[PDB]
Design a protein around this ligand. Sequence first.
Ligand code: GGG
Ligand code: GGG
Lengths: 358, 352
Amino acid sequence: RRIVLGLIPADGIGKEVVPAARRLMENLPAKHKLKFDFIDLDAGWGTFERTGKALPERTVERLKTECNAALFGAVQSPTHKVAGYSSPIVALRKKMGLYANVRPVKSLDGAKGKPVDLVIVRENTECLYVKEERMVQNTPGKRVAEAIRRISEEASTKIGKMAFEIAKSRQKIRESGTYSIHKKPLVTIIHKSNVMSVTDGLFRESCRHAQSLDPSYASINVDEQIVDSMVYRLFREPECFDVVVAPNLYGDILSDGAASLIGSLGLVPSANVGDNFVMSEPVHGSAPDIAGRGIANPVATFRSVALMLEFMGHQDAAADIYTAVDKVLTEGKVLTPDLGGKSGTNEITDAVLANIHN
Amino acid sequence: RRIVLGLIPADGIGKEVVPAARRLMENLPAKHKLKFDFIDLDAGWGTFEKALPERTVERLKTECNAALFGAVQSPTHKVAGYSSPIVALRKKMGLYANVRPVKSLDGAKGKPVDLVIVRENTECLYVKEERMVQNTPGKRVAEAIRRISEEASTKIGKMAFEIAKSRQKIRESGTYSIHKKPLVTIIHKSNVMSVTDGLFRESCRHAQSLDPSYASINVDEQIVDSMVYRLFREPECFDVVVAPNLYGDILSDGAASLIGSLGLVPSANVGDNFVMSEPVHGSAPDIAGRGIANPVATFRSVALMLEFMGHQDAAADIYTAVDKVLTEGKVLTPDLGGKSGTNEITDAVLAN
Ligand SMILES: NCC(=O)NCC(=O)NCC(=O)O
Ligand SMILES: NCC(=O)NCC(=O)NCC(=O)O
């Protein structure tokens, strides 16, 4: 089977980790029956500097017309507004219909402290990220600003459905015989209904109603958790969570909190998922302090590729990637500076490849 | 000095830890020169079964210099007539700052931390201004208003600097601290909320200029997401943290998770002429009335309240007395892995 994959390295260590991932993809075992054709695409801060547009329209056109999926590196986002610049990643997610931001956090077997195997499913189109704000009073010393938080039944139902689909997929993997810390599947709905009774009420009702949309979701357990005690429980008993579904802001904050459970950010994967497309993306940024020195950790990117392949229906390939990656990490011989080692990007790519062909 | 203290034990273990704290206050050693008058007030879930009687408010305004609140057994769903009494108390008494010290005991298991989350407690999304703007079956759309004002944000900013200054003075009096330098970290998400969070940031930065003695305090700015990430890994990097309402709520609960038992974590709601101490733990229905609740969070919230009332001496010796018991490890409640009751640990602190 053929996958046409858009490659969008963008900036800094994006330009090192995406070629690493291409090498991984090109060299998957024959048993997977998976070939890739790649298309190189331009986006990011460097694209903005050269052309005045962070996301060329041609890049979006090729994605929609040629590609089955994409891999995005990292954008060197400015720290203030720049005229003519807008985030190409936020733009690509909107333009490609990628409404779900999926962030799995899974500890290594034999890791210290509480084990974790959870997935945060973050609604990624609305809430406060509609960016609709006004300075309603401009009195010197007494300004008043207001922002709109918007929650819709349609978007919330869609994200709830995606959570149940993910829960169902994880449960099938368990039932196929792969060990899991969870004995029962669970979707935990995150909210703050005691303050946001109308908006979070809608979010909650919509996610609960999503369970009714397919008879195969009926077996999945559902509960609800207030956001603040969710952070409390995340740090102390993260083993209690399977699939967690949240509106945009709570999901953003919880995903970043959960990333802390597994050590270096160069280990943390993500995918942006829509109904007809998926874009993998490592959680780390462009790391300009180390860009060009051949020491970037490509593990987050590898796991992001594997996550993408999970959503595309290549469970076997994904599982072998995860196993090969974890073996490198547990063995602890080949480690990049962010892992406390002295090894380079290419050394760790070679190590993953050596394991996958074992 | 004489303090008139409203006692609002409200629900569950609130009914046990508040009497424990009353006793402590009655037994404050002569050298602190501090006596209390106590007034018993009614509020909470039991009080509803109205959550907050008007009498309670009237008495706070006109008789009390401070107050101590236990815990409300909050329901899991909405109830006609019922609105949170602790939320209404804070607004009525003008308690704009929610203050949560998270401080590990020297030698305790767990990650060293010594920070205070200073949470703006009046606005942001908590203005509770929502509307179902589209009501079409299947296609509903709801909206809420997040409001950030320069005046509220400057005020919480100023409070954060006051607390940073007061903590630096404690260090310089000879109390050991994991911090060599005072720091205010301003929390925001201005890459998403450019206008509202931009105003919060500007206002807190400007609050530094309100007292010349703050110029010496280091200031930085951190995105709420990174801050949650950093709390788990390197909480020792933070001193005073100032945040708008929602980010403050999430961070205070993230920070609290660092301490082994919630029975050790205090808080105070602070306004310009009033303070109300309040333990962080809930009403703990499933140990209530068994005489084993941990009163330490309550003692430390009393201690916190005393600091804000200008009794650093009293507060120090409560912290020292409480710290001493905890470090001996002889008289500990079950949540600390011990076998002692509420009254026995109160006795133990009283002994110091
Ligand atoms: N792949 C990580 C990355 O590019 N980070 C920079 C950025 O601006 N990300 C957008 C976001 O936080 O959603
Ligand atoms: N003392 C903590 C407490 O009462 N928790 C229950 C609760 O819902 N309190 C509301 C709040 O403190 O914000």
